Design a protein around this ligand. Structure first.
Ligand SMILES: [Cl-]
Ligand SMILES: [Cl-]
Ligand SMILES: [Cl-]
Length: 124
């Protein structure tokens, strides 16, 4: 099985680009990361920062998670992100996504040792 940390990296990290340049970014990335394999994952965001910067959020502002747990952290600064969301049209296996690029703070749940991001909570 994939570890939680590895899964977070595969689904959410894209340090290779500074921002999504095309409206087709999500369609390509969702496919490349194998997120459209058995179904179309409906929502998924990509962070365009280095892995080290994202991991460093686990030592930033501690906040409650939407679930009430307290292992969530919000980034002190805004980061480049791309939100991918399935369009009302979209039908597996013809996955189609809307790409929305933005700069905002991210909120992640961290766990383990080393203590790293394992889940996204939100972005703001
Ligand atoms: Cl790992
Ligand atoms: Cl994979
Ligand atoms: Cl997400």
């Amino acid at each position: 099985k994939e570890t939680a940390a590895a899964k977070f990296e595969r689904q959410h990290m894209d340090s290779s680009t500074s921002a999504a340049s095309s409206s087709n970014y999500c369609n390509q990335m969702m496919k490349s990361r194998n997120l459209t394999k058995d179904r179309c994952k409906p929502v998924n965001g990509f962070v365009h920062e280095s892995l080290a910067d994202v991991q460093a959020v686990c030592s930033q502002k501690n906040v409650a998670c939407k679930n009430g747990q307290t292992n969530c952290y919000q980034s002190y600064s805004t980061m480049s992100i791309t939100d991918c969301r399935e369009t009302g049209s979209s039908k597996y296996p013809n996955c189609a996504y809307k790409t929305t690029q933005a700069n905002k703070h991210i909120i992640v749940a961290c766990e383990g040792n080393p203590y790293v991001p394992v889940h996204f909570d939100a972005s703001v």
